């Protein structure tokens, strides 16, 4: 009865933390993966204008 409940209880807390886990967890990626492109134009800008 109550023996059943902690199942999706724990499950709950877990995937729950997970959501954030995922999100933040590719935040870093996406950003660094952006500014490699950044510095990627930064050589282009220093190619004349430096």
């Amino acid at each position: 009865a109550e023996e059943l409940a902690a199942a999706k209880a724990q499950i709950a807390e877990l995937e729950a933390k997970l959501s954030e886990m995922e999100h933040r967890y590719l935040r870093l990626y996406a950003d660094f993966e952006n500014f490699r492109r950044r510095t990627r134009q930064e050589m282009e800008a220093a190619e004349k204008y430096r």
Binding site: R27, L28, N34
Partner: protein
């Protein structure tokens, strides 16, 4: 998703900033300007905004100049083809700031946050979230300038405390006294001056200057505006110099020419009068809160013109201690806006530790000549891989010996690993490929692999300590490489390419 982008508007001081990774970032504008400013215009069918709007301002019907004064007011401008309101004009301030943060990042910011005054209340500080969303960029909250840079830095590790800010506007002054609610900010006191600041400073320079030139040649200055521009600029220079530097001069020559040796304590006795137009706002705060100059836990330096030692020699002898200078005060509102911007919609609790590598790691070439793969200082959770080939034709097997240190030599370095690998196919030297991935985890035990290709037979090692020892012992060696300063004489074994026989 999307990152929550800061935009402050400080009425002639303004910025839109962001956070990429673990370091706080101050954006660049379309103009070469580190920051382009708050004022704008219009014309037929086409808008003009920023530093590009503002010099078409003394040349064209449309210029709005520091509209901060009308936010939260019933103020309405009569302008061509429709009268206008602070909101619709600011919608364009941040429409342009939107295209500009977009033409920087490429990963759009829809969600954004603002920097307002600490004095403001239900009327105008709503006007912020509202006009914030008028341009189209939503506001996930509105900070206040002072609690803002307070949390650009940030106070929440620390304990229940008290503080007073320093706002230096563009020709406005302010300070706002604050306290910690052990996780809560409520701004307590407010003071400052409606016109005082950097431009005024430049004009005491331009004033004593022009007055002194009428003091010599009898010939007056201010009638002439490329001359006076020359003045504003060169005098700004001498200013920030007096701040940093111990002595100065100004080369303004081919005037029509003034060449002077610019002084510091004359500029100081020049400027040491309005530094007590501040002490007024300051101590008026000290009474608005009730707690004496001796009641505070931390205090700060903000604004553009705050970089000179004038106010700071007025303070070290005012409140007892030095300010936190750990910022680049000029833009210091912007980033602050986004700090929590990414504390909300984004990353949570941060160690950011073992971010460095003890030493340059490499291995045993050509009888001990040491080549690096890993350098020093390198964030630990990483691994680098490289593939050598055959010492000599028919190497039936290859032993592996790895070093840690800098000095390019065998026992001039610390023997780390020795282990060997056999079965290689017999064949000409240099040809067969053997890989070694130095595989460095975060936690400090380093794995390292070497495996033939064509074999796919592989031997690797799991080391133990990597250090086992202390700081001084290492740095005594980091010193030691320097100390040797050319044991590089082993370019002698570099000419041992004699090994080649043909």
């Amino acid at each position: 998703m999307s990152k929550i982008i800061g935009i402050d508007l400080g009425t002639t001081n303004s910025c839109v900033a962001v956070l990429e990774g673990g370091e706080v970032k101050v954006i660049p504008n379309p103009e070469g300007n580190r920051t382009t400013p708050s004022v704008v215009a219009f014309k037929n069918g086409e808008r003009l905004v920023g530093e590009v709007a503002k010099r078409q301002a003394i040349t064209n019907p449309n210029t709005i100049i520091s509209i901060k004064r009308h936010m939260g007011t019933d103020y309405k401008v009569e302008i061509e083809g429709k009268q206008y309101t602070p909101q619709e004009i600011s919608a364009i301030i941040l429409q342009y700031l939107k295209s500009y943060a977009e033409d920087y990042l490429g990963e759009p910011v829809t969600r954004a946050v603002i920097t307002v005054p600490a004095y403001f209340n239900d009327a105008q500080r709503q006007a912020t979230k509202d006009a914030g969303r008028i341009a189209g960029l939503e506001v996930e909250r509105i900070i206040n300038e002072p609690t803002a840079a307070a949390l650009a830095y940030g106070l929440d590790k620390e304990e229940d405390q008290t503080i007073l800010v320093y706002d230096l506007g563009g020709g406005t002054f302010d300070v706002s006294i604050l306290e910690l609610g052990d996780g809560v900010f409520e701004v307590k006191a407010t003071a400052g001056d409606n016109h005082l600041g950097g431009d005024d400073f430049d004009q005491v320079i331009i004033d004593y200057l022009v007055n002194q030139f009428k003091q010599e040649h009898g010939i007056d200055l201010s009638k002439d505006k490329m001359a006076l521009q020359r003045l504003k600029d060169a005098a700004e220079k001498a200013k920030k110099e007096l701040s940093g530097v111990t002595q100065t001069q100004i080369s303004l020559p081919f005037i029509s020419h003034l060449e002077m040796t610019l002084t510091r304590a004359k500029f100081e006795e020049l400027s040491a009068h309005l530094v007590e137009r501040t002490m007024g706002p300051v101590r008026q705060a000290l009474q608005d809160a009730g707690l004496t100059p001796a009641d505070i836990d931390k205090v700060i330096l903000v604004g553009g013109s705050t970089r000179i030692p004038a106010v700071q020699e007025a303070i070290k002898r005012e409140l007892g201690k030095e300010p936190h200078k750990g910022v680049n005060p000029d833009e210091v509102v912007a980033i602050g806006a986004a700090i929590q911007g990414g504390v909300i919609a984004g990353e949570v609790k941060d160690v950011v530790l073992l971010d460095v590598t003890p030493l340059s790691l490499g291995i045993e070439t050509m009888g001990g000549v040491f080549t690096k793969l890993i350098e020093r200082n390198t964030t630990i959770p990483t691994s680098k891989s490289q593939v050598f080939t055959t010492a000599a034709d028919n190497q039936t097997t290859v032993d592996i010996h790895v070093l840690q240190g800098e000095r390019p030599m065998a026992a001039d370095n610390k023997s780390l690993g020795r282990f060997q690998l056999t079965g290689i196919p017999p064949a000409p030297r240099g040809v067969p490929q053997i890989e070694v991935t130095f595989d460095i985890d975060a936690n400090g035990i380093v794995h390292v692999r070497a495996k033939d290709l064509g074999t796919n037979k592989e031997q690797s090692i799991t080391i133990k300590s990597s250090s086992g020892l202390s700081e001084e012992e290492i740095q005594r060696m980091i010193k030691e490489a320097e100390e040797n300063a050319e044991a590089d004489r082993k370019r002698k074994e570099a000419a041992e390419l004699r090994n080649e026989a043909d």
